[PDB]
Structures are given as structure tokens and as C-alpha cells.
């Protein structure tokens, strides 16, 4: 029924690849909208992630209230970053 195998159509050129890390998974699965939020941070040397799975709520827009974001991991690499793209997974027709 459900294996969730994925195909990497994101890159082609595995060249000069420097650092590897394996982490624990970030998302887990709850009837309403569990908002999942992340903060990508650019500090000199280190890049911190600040995450929350909210509890279940029904706001079509942004909800109100306060959410405290916790530091998970900083990443000691230290490069310039000017842009961003995300990545999605879909069985899309041709």
C-alpha cells in the first residue's frame, strides 16, 4: 500500500562535496492544521534552525498567539548564501 520511496531529480552534479551529516527526522504525524514552522538563520560560521509543530487549529490565515521556537542545531560551515529554493515531493504527470 504505502512505501514512500523518493527519487532525486533535484541535483545532477555531485562535485567537490564537503560535509555530510545525518540527523533525526524533523516532521512527524492531528486532524486540523498543525502548522509547522522553521527559521533559517545566517550567522557567521553557524546556521541555526528554530522549529515548532503547533497543535491543531483551524485558521485559514496565520493564527494568533505566541509560539516559542527552540534551537536545534547550528551548522559550522560558514558560506555566503544569497538565495533560497525549497523542495517538494510529488507523483506529477508528464
Amino acid at each position: 500500500k504505502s512505501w514512500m520511496e523518493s527519487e532525486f531529480r533535484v541535483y545532477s552534479s555531485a562535485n567537490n562535496c564537503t560535509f555530510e551529516y545525518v540527523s533525526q527526522p524533523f516532521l512527524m504525524d492531528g486532524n486540523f492544521k498543525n502548522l509547522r514552522e522553521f527559521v533559517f538563520k545566517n550567522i557567521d560560521g553557524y546556521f541555526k534552525i528554530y522549529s515548532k509543530h503547533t497543535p491543531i487549529n483551524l485558521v485559514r490565515d496565520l493564527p494568533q498567539g505566541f509560539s516559542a521556537l527552540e534551537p536545534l542545531v547550528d551548522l559550522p560551515i560558514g558560506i555566503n548564501i544569497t538565495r533560497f529554493q525549497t523542495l517538494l515531493a510529488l507523483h506529477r504527470s508528464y
Partner: antibody
Amino acid sequence: QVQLVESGGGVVQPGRSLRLSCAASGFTFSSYGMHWVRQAPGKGLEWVAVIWYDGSNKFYADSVKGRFTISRDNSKNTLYLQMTSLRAEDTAVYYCARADYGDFFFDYWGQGTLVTVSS
Amino acid sequence: SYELTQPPSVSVSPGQTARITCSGDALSKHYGYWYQQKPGQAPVLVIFKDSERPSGIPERFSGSSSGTTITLTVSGVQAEDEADYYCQSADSSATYWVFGGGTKLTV
């Protein structure tokens, strides 16, 4: 029933160019991807080429990569081929198979266009 | 990609038609299709999604496709059965279509 008019067939010298056209009729041309299946007689069928409904990407059979550009245009309502520098593998019957995403079936098969070389 | 593990010839004449059986590991990923090769050289779709028949089909049973193989839509022996069958499966996502070589059904 709607139908496909595939053409361009005939004989050619090996290793030089030949175009294989396939007019579409009766349906909308701007919603369906078209395939091409080559089959030398005496053996089995083999898909060779496909593009999108608008031709956004050009995806081919893996043996015959890079030699052939295929193109559509929605005003002319045809898809044609071009056979640059074959190695006498195109002694084959070439079909137009309509494909409409029922997880990639082949709806309306063509009549079959022959290319065979005189070597 | 891999060619579909097919029969090349099922020469068959009891009243029951014996089981044409084509298989493969990408058939586990996405369900496989079947196409004939009729004399007159018009291939037709005979079973799609292994449950439901096309419009204008010769009226038969359907596919079942139990596991890694496909058991298909054949009935008892008629006069149109000598047109053979061809396997068809798409791959996972890299848009490839494989065939095997075709069967052969013979009374």
C-alpha cells in the same frame, strides 16, 4: 471517433536526416502528450520519444539519446520528428499513441509509419 | 530499463484459455497495462488499471494482477484470439515504457 494522421514515412539513406510527421485531429492538441513507438517487424514494440502537452521537456528512449529533437506546435496541430545520423536501427514501424494520464496508458494507436534504409 | 518477464508464445486450445502471465518488479510500483497486436497492425488497449474494461472492448472478464505478475482478462476460446498480447508498464518517475517481446496465442 477522433483520429491521428501520421505521415512522413518512406525510404532514406542511412546516417542522414528524415522527418516523420503526425497530424492530430478531432481533439484538443493543447492538453495531451503524444508518444512514439518504434517496432522493427519480427520483434517487439519499443517506445522511442515523448514530449509534454506543450512540449516543455523532451524525453526519449535511453539508447537513442541526443540524436533526435522532436517538436510540436499547437497552430499546426502536428508533431514531427527528425532522424539525424541513424546507425540502421530504424528499419521500424513508427506509431502515434495518444496518451491521456490514466497513469500513462496509450489510448489511440496510429496506423504506423515505416522507415527502412537501403543499405 | 528491464524487459518485462513475459511468455513469448502460449499456443492454447482447450475450452479454457490458459494463463498468460507477465511480471516484473516495477509492476509492484505502478500497475501494468496490456496491448494487443492485431493483424491489420492496430494495437488496442485491452485492460487498464487491472480492474476496468475500455469502451468498445470485446466483452470479457477483467484483469486481476495478483502480486508481481498479471493475470488478465481472457475468456474461453473465440475466433479473435489469435491476435497476441504485449506487456506494458511505466516505471516509477523517470518516464520509461517497457514491453517485453509480445506473446503469441495460437489455437
